[PDB]
């Protein structure tokens, strides 16, 4: 089958900024392109055909091109309502194969997490669970790094993260991340500590709480 | 205005079969080919088949053939996709489409052999006193639930601002969420602050308060 290689897969830019995606073609496609857009609700429309031609009432910032192997769709000036996912299409040999996508997000400045840590609930221990949890609150960029702790030692095991899309008011991305562990064996232990490494320093952001503390 | 309806939501167990239809609008239904299209994880996307109205042919992605059956009905002017043999790497959203040009909203089509089970609700207050620029974040752990969505409030509704409320993760065949809420801190503990978690699939809404529990 054709691959359509798509990048970037993440883009950061603001409005009035110009940008461009890109698909680059496993195999000769030559004009058989589509360029798609995705809202957040689902809701897929297409903006280009045959690599070029703009939809009957698309917006003119909006182009496609190609050169060689690799096919672009540019956005000359970027509006509030841009801000979404693009998939390119080839549609020259079955099976019909997409780029995975571009997602444009809005350029902020950096912002430091604000980190916070809970101790499990006693409701919680008293069903036998131990849940810990670490907030990683609006920051930006996107990348982040979490790392726990149990009395000094790195802990992998039982942690699951998870990370909400860009905040529509601010900007900022968030995280949770959360260690679980038996009552028992969350009782044998201490200091709990959650570790945020963010490009907003190079020394990690650390929090913890003791296990009997006040 | 040209349009294609799609059915809803589908939640099935494993080895179950389900069949999603595209109601279409518009235009002259036997003349333009109907595609079917799969996005998984809420971005990758796979083209399943296609078929042509005016005679029946149909056309696969052969990653597809043993699992997806195209029909149409020239009446209700509807296509269908049949999925069989269902396993949780099927869950995903499908689509139909005129073309690749036209689409439709979307079909959630989720397996899982759980059980619908509520959640439990464990309120997440801070170990100690300490603020920071003179706030206080608290929280609310869900957890165990069965299926999605649940939807957290604060304050029913009343603290809207300063919410995160984090997508699921799924453990063991069954959900996880947290919800954070951030206030002045010469809010709380001096006035109440409660999360409400509705699970719709149950029928449950339970409240949870924020105790404080740091000792100065």
């Known amino acids: 089958d054709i691959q359509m290689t798509q990048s970037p897969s993440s883009l950061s830019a603001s409005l009035g900024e110009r940008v461009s995606l890109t698909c680059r073609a496993s195999?000769?496609?030559?004009?058989?392109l589509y360029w798609l857009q995705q809202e957040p609700d689902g809701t897929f429309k297409r903006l280009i055909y045959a690599t070029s031609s703009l939809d009957s009432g698309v917006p003119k910032r909006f182009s496609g091109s190609r050169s060689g192997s690799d096919y672009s769709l540019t956005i000359s000036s970027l509006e509030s309502e841009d801000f979404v996912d693009y998939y390119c299409?080839?549609?020259?040999?079955?099976?019909?194969?997409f780029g995975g996508g571009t997602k444009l997000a809005i350029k902020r400045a950096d912002a430091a997490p604000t980190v916070s840590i809970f101790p499990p609930s006693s409701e919680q221990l008293t069903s036998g669970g131990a849940s810990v949890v670490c907030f990683l609150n609006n920051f930006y960029p996107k990348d982040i790094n979490v790392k726990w702790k149990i009395d000094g030692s790195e802990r992998q095991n039982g942690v699951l993260n998870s990370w909400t899309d860009q905040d529509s008011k601010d900007s900022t991305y968030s995280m949770s991340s959360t260690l679980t562990l038996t009552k028992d064996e969350y009782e044998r232990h201490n200091s709990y500590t959650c570790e945020a490494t963010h490009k907003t320093s190079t020394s990690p952001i650390v929090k913890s709480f003791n296990r009997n503390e006040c | 205005e040209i349009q294609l309806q799609q059915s809803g939501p589908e939640l099935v167990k494993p080895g179950a079969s389900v069949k999603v239809s595209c109601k279409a609008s518009?235009?002259?239904?036997?003349?333009?080919?109907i595609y079917w299209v799969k996005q998984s994880h809420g971005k990758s996307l796979e083209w399943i088949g296609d078929i042509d109205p005016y005679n029946g042919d149909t056309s696969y992605n052969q990653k597809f053939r043993d699992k997806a059956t195209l029909t149409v009905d020239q009446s209700s002017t509807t296509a269908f996709m049949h999925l069989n043999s269902l396993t949780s790497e099927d869950s995903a959203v499908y689509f139909c489409?005129?073309?690749?040009?036209?689409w439709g909203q979307g079909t959630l089509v989720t397996v899982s052999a759980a059980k619908t089970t509520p959640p439990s609700v464990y309120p997440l207050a801070p170990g100690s006193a300490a603020q920071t620029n003179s706030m206080v974040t608290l929280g609310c752990l869900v957890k165990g639930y069965f299926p999605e969505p649940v939807t957290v409030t604060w304050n029913s509704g009343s603290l809207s601002s300063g919410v995160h409320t984090f997508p699921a993760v799924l453990q063991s065949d069954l959900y996880t969420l947290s919800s954070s809420v951030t206030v002045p801190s010469s809010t709380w503990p001096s006035e109440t602050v409660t999360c409400n978690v509705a699970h719709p699939a149950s029928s449950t809404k339970v409240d949870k308060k924020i105790v404080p529990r740091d000792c100065g």
């Open positions: 518009g235009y002259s239904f036997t003349d333009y080919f």
């Open positions: 195999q000769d496609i030559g004009s058989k």
């Open positions: 489409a005129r073309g690749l040009r036209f």
């Open positions: 299409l080839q549609y020259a040999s079955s099976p019909y194969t």
